[PDB]
Design a protein around this motif. Structure first.
Motif, PDB file in Angstrom:
ATOM      1  N   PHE A  19       0.860  -1.179   0.000  1.00  0.00           N
ATOM      2  CA  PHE A  19       0.000   0.000   0.000  1.00  0.00           C
ATOM      3  C   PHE A  19       0.897   1.230   0.000  1.00  0.00           C
ATOM      4  N   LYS A  22       1.057  -4.049  -5.876  1.00  0.00           N
ATOM      5  CA  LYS A  22       1.147  -2.648  -5.488  1.00  0.00           C
ATOM      6  C   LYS A  22      -0.257  -2.031  -5.521  1.00  0.00           C
ATOM      7  N   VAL A  23      -0.632  -1.341  -4.452  1.00  0.00           N
ATOM      8  CA  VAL A  23      -1.941  -0.699  -4.355  1.00  0.00           C
ATOM      9  C   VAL A  23      -1.748   0.802  -4.106  1.00  0.00           C
ATOM     10  N   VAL A  31      -2.961   3.869  -2.877  1.00  0.00           N
ATOM     11  CA  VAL A  31      -4.079   4.292  -2.030  1.00  0.00           C
ATOM     12  C   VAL A  31      -4.876   5.491  -2.555  1.00  0.00           C
ATOM     13  N   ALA A  84      -7.889   0.851   0.260  1.00  0.00           N
ATOM     14  CA  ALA A  84      -7.107   1.453   1.339  1.00  0.00           C
ATOM     15  C   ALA A  84      -7.985   1.585   2.574  1.00  0.00           C
ATOM     16  N   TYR A 112      -8.744  -1.933   4.201  1.00  0.00           N
ATOM     17  CA  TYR A 112      -7.640  -2.448   5.012  1.00  0.00           C
ATOM     18  C   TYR A 112      -7.249  -1.483   6.122  1.00  0.00           C
ATOM     19  N   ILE A 135      -5.852   1.613   6.124  1.00  0.00           N
ATOM     20  CA  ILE A 135      -4.491   2.102   5.997  1.00  0.00           C
ATOM     21  C   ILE A 135      -4.350   3.527   6.513  1.00  0.00           C
ATOM     22  N   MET A 147       2.221   4.995   5.351  1.00  0.00           N
ATOM     23  CA  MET A 147       2.819   4.539   4.095  1.00  0.00           C
ATOM     24  C   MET A 147       4.315   4.307   4.307  1.00  0.00           C
TER      25      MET A 147
END
Length: 106
Positions: free
Chosen positions: A27, A57-58, A60, A67, A70, A72, A75
């Motif tokens: 993330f 790869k995400v 956000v 994002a 989860y 988040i 980073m």
């Protein structure tokens, strides 16, 4: 060798398709310094364990819904999934812990 998902759909399909491999969700955000630092190590690991690990790869900023799902808030954040189970998770560009987790779950 470091696929970047497009949405929950592209992600879910990827997890399903990831058979019995270790899945690493990265993330990140383009504007975050720590994320740019750890990327070289990610490509290295990804290449070295090309058959036992898949790195997703995400971004956000683009996948707010993921994002958010989860939860988040730092980073980068790495979520480790093996056979649908979340084996590990931690935030921060800690190259050493990233490699230890990968080698401990492949």
């Amino acid at each position: 060798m470091v696929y970047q998902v497009k949405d929950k759909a592209d992600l879910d399909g990827q997890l399903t398709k990831a058979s019995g491999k270790l899945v690493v969700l990265d993330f990140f955000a383009t504007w975050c310094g720590p994320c740019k630092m750890i990327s070289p190590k990610l490509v290295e690991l990804s290449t070295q364990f090309a058959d036992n690990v898949v790195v997703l790869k995400v971004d956000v900023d683009e996948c707010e819904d993921i994002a958010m799902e989860y939860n988040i808030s730092s980073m980068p954040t790495f979520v480790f999934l093996k056979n649908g189970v979340k084996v590990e998770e931690f935030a921060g560009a800690n190259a050493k812990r990233l490699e230890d987790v990968i080698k401990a779950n492949i």
